[PDB]
């Protein structure tokens, strides 16, 4: 009966997922009939288990507990079907509880039982932290109502849905700012509600800045703590042709071929540059053809990649699919580089490790998409003017008043438009929920759903504010809870693969080397070395750096800065002279910071000379005076240490970043091949600043999509409806044929891959730093040993091995009790 009941559950979920807008009458009849037979089958199966296992042990499991609730709710609903059930929204919400029988699919995964047990154990802590967050949100919503409530009285016709007019709207606005999506628009509205970009008007931005920073910090704390702690408990309970010259030449040729492929001209098929590129490509392929034959003469899973690449390159000396299939050339470097192959294998192992959370999250998103289909089926239709509520009314022409002036008129045709992201069927609902989970355009969907009026009718302003519960619950459950567990899964998984304090200390002792101190002779120079090295000098010049930074920020749009620039330049030049005199130019350049100061002072001197010669008779040379406070970093030991450790961690793992670089390269080239012929039109998402026409532009577009900008708008901007570029070659008669429906796969896959790779890189760097990150700053650490080295160099100018025996006695007094 296990497979029988799984088959019944599969049939039920198919019947649930088969429902959509404007379905044929036979489909509606079948779905109505299929509910009765499956409910009867569930009832029959329940009764057999009542005798097979008894009435007493059946209720000891939550697994079989909700089956009785499901069957009784179904019976009650079927019995009340014959009644006069009005309010189509009401009968839809009584069709929503028919969807709770989808949990019989979750009922079969036993690998999540260990995690859910920790959740049930720590439910009290979860509720406490969520209650603190909810109180924070309530307080800031009340503050926003006090500040911006009733002050959005703008005379223009622009509509601003995210306001603070009442408590629910203030809560929605605060939540939207908390998610960080389009919060700057809310800040601009709040600023302009006051005087504007004036002295007292702009101070309301403090509210938004504090709200964003504090809410994001609280969110990180609560969700990261919940995820890491619960997953730690879950895991804890679980445990209970061969020469290097040839290969270097081949790799250089791989890079050259990739670079030649990247810098193409997709717009012009026949161009001057394209012919040279084709000549270079055939020249490269000639070298690669004589390379594969050499390898097989000396030998008998990675060589077939080169063979396929050479074959598809030689086949060119749909008929253009193989033109885009030559983007596999950068993948030829996986085999040549051992580290690249290792990191690819590691990321594949990581992908296979995280398989349960992905599946359960997708299945929960499927249930939420079904609920959204039940809630907003057909209600996302609209007209140009919101006065025409039906498709038959939305015909003809209407007046549009630009800038809100009744005397400035323009005629536009009335057209019955349909929202780009809707809930008509399960697939469209899943796409909409995926867009929501990325926090991109979710306020627009929320406000479109609030105004949803009827099955085939236009929106009504603020019709159903209670529909925000659906979106808020989906965001909290999916975009906040399960997403954080996925991030927390990788952290603990990598920590598993990551005494020892004594080993580290003994390794430091064995491998340490003394550092130079450069104690000078010639007491006349010793005096200047004493004045330079004294803490008073460094305090004075830190003050001077602070003063220079303060003076730099005083400039504004609409001459005193010139003389102060010269004064500061002279003071720093005198520093440079004094340091050179004190250190005799030998130990001066041994310090990288002194090299930086030399560079900065030389740049500032050149900038001053250039300004003076311009006055006698270039914009970026002024940036040298900005880098002056970079040298302030040498005094903040903690900041410098943190920066150094994370920078060396980034240097340690460059291959993980190379995966992201290769992903960006491949996707950019594919995008130029696919969407490179779309025209640049103002008012669209493909324009002079955002397009696939050149490789740098494509890379910038992909980078913008990675940083969570309006990527779904770019996705909509390329779907088989776009005017083709005039310079592109197309047959006369057709111009609106550029763009492909492949953009959905392209953008969704790129978003998922980029998110996963960025998470992997971040966790790799964190695990590299984990030795410093989880460090007790009280028992003992490398900082004490570094201080010991510093005092040794104080007592020992040059390395020269060890020092006199009598001098060892005094330095032990300076050693702290933790070390000695």
């Amino acid at each position: 009966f296990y497979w029988l009941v799984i088959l019944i559950v599969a049939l039920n979920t198919l019947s649930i997922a088969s429902e959509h807008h404007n379905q044929p009458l036979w489909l509606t009849h079948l779905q109505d009939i299929a509910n009765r037979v499956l409910l009867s089958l569930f009832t029959i199966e329940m009764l057999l288990k009542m005798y097979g296992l008894g009435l007493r042990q059946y209720f000891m499991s939550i697994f079989n507990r909700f089956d009785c609730f499901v069957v009784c709710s179904g019976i009650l609903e079927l019995l009340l079907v014959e009644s006069g059930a009005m309010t189509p929204l009401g009968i839809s919400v009584l069709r929503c509880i028919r969807l709770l029988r989808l949990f019989k699919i979750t009922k079969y995964w036993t690998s999540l039982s260990n995690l859910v047990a920790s959740l049930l154990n720590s439910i009290r802590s979860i509720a406490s932290l969520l209650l603190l967050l909810f109180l924070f949100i309530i307080i800031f919503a009340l503050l926003g109502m006090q500040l911006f409530g009733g002050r959005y009285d703008f005379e223009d016709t622009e509509v601003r849905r995210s306001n603070f007019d009442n408590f629910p709207q203030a809560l929605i606005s605060v939540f939207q700012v908390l998610t960080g999506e389009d919060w700057n628009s809310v800040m601009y509205n709040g600023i302009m509600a006051y005087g504007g970009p004036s002295y007292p008007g702009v101070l309301v931005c403090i509210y938004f800045i504090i709200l964003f920073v504090c809410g994001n910090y609280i969110l990180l704390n609560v969700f990261l703590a919940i995820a890491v702690d619960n997953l730690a408990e879950a895991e804890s309970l679980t445990s209970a042709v061969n020469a290097t010259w040839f290969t270097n030449f081949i790799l250089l040729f791989i890079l050259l071929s990739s670079a030649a492929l990247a810098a193409e001209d997709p717009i012009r098929a026949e161009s001057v540059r394209n012919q040279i590129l084709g000549y270079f490509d055939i020249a490269f392929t000639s070298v690669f053809t004589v390379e594969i034959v050499l390898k097989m003469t000396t030998y008998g899973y990675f060589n077939i990649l080169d063979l396929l690449v050479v074959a598809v390159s030689l086949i060119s000396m749909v008929v253009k699919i193989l033109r885009v299939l030559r983007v596999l050339r950068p993948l030829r470097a996986i085999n040549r580089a051992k580290g690249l192959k290792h990191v690819v294998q590691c990321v594949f192992v990581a992908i296979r490790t995280i398989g349960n959370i992905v599946l359960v999250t997708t299945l929960l998103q499927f249930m939420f998409a079904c609920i959204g289909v039940q809630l907003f089926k057909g209600k996302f239709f609209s007209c140009n003017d919101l006065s025409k509520m039906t498709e038959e009314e939305c015909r003809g022409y209407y007046y549009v008043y630009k800038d809100g002036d009744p005397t400035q008129m323009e005629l536009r045709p009335r057209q019955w438009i349909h929202n780009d992201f809707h809930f008509d069927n399960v697939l469209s609902a899943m796409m909409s929920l995926f867009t929501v989970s990325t926090f991109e355009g979710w306020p627009q969907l929320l406000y479109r759903a609030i105004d949803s009026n009827e099955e085939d009718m236009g929106p009504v302003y603020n019709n159903r504010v209670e529909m925000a519960i659906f979106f808020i619950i989906y965001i909290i459950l999916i975009a906040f809870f399960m997403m954080n567990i996925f991030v927390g899964f990788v952290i603990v998984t990598f920590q598993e693969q990551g005494d020892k304090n004594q080993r580290q200390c003994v390794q430091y002792a064995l491998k340490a080397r003394p550092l130079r101190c450069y104690i000078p002779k010639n007491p006349y120079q010793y005096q200047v070395w004493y004045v330079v090295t004294s803490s008073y000098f460094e305090y004075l010049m830190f003050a001077l750096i602070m003063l220079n930074t303060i003076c730099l920020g005083m400039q504004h749009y609409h001459h005193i800065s010139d003389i102060l620039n010269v004064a500061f330049t002279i003071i720093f030049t005198l520093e440079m002279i004094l340091k050179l005199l004190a250190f005799k130019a030998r130990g001066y350049f041994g310090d990288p910071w002194n090299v930086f100061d030399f560079l900065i002072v030389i740049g500032s001197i050149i900038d001053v000379i250039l300004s003076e010669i311009d006055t006698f008779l270039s914009a970026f040379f002024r940036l040298f005076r900005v880098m002056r406070l970079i040298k302030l970093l040498s005094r903040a030991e903690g900041v410098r240490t943190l920066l150094w450790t994370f920078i060396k961690s980034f240097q340690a793992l460059p291959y993980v970043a190379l995966l992201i670089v290769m992903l960006f390269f491949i996707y950019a080239v594919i995008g130029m091949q696919m969407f490179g012929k779309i025209a640049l039109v103002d008012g669209t998402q493909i324009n002079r600043n955002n397009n696939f026409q050149t490789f740098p532009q494509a890379v910038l577009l992909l980078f913008r999509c990675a940083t969570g900008e309006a990527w779904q708008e770019i996705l909509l901007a390329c779907s088989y409806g776009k005017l083709c570029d005039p310079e592109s070659d197309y047959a006369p008669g057709e111009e609106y044929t550029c763009g492909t429906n492949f953009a959905y796969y392209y953008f969704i896959s790129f978003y998922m891959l980029c998110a996963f790779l960025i998470i992997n890189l971040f966790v790799a760097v964190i695990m590299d730093n984990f030795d410093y990150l989880t460090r007790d700053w009280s028992i003992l650490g490398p900082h004490h040993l570094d201080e010991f080295k510093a005092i040794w160099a104080e007592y020992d100018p040059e390395a020269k091995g060890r020092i006199k025996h009598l001098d060892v006695v005094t330095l032990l007094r300076r050693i702290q009790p933790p070390l000695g």
């Binding site: 603190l132 503050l143 504007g196 702009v202 930074t549 730099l552 920020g553 994370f646 103002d682 971040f762």
Partner: protein, 284 residues
Amino acid sequence: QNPLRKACISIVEWKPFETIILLTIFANCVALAVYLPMPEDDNNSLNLGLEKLEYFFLTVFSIEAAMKIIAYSGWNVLDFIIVFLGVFTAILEQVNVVKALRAFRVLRPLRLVSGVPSLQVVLNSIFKAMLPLFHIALLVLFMVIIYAIIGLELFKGKMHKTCYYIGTDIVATVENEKPSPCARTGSGRPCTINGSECRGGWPGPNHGITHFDNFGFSMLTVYQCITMEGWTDVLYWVNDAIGNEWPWIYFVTLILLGSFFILNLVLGVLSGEFTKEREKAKSR
């Protein structure tokens, strides 16, 4: 301190008197929630009713504070300052026969935390998990200041030209385009609208909010870019103002450093502190 001449009012605190105070705090929070703000000094019946009800909460809080002070701390001083602000506002309101001072009433929900030890210790732990982030916050401020100054010296007074119509003060745009800077006879962007021309006297892109005109606005736009919410708009506006060759370096480097690197640092430090706390509490 004082003898048994006033301490006859310390016998109800041990009784579940705190429950009544918690319920009245919840009632005050609900009354704050149902208030409907109105433009230009307008009101309705409910708002007038809530204003009178505000005195009932004030009297209860004041008598409770006076009752506890006679019979006898960080969290009790908060109640005192809230009640003092409430009574001070009530006194000021009836003698000037300003509404900005009324904003202090949003501190009442903090008494809910003040009355529950669980949220008390939760807030204490959350604050205690903030001290290691001091160096990261210093680095963030340092980077923000540097980038604000760089933007001030690079893009000062550049986004002040847009294409108006011929002889009018109306900005020329298209159906779904926000106003953007413009440049005439340069490397910037020339306007392609038919009856349009490029001239100055334009406050700025976002109603005069997004520009590197002085230190404050440069800091504001740099902070907005660091959150990665609208940084592409600033980059595109700067490209239209001066050209799309150099500025991408500035904006892409800012996004890479102040957004991804800083987030990685914060995540690493928080994970380290969380693991350290778990390992410290494991032996207990």
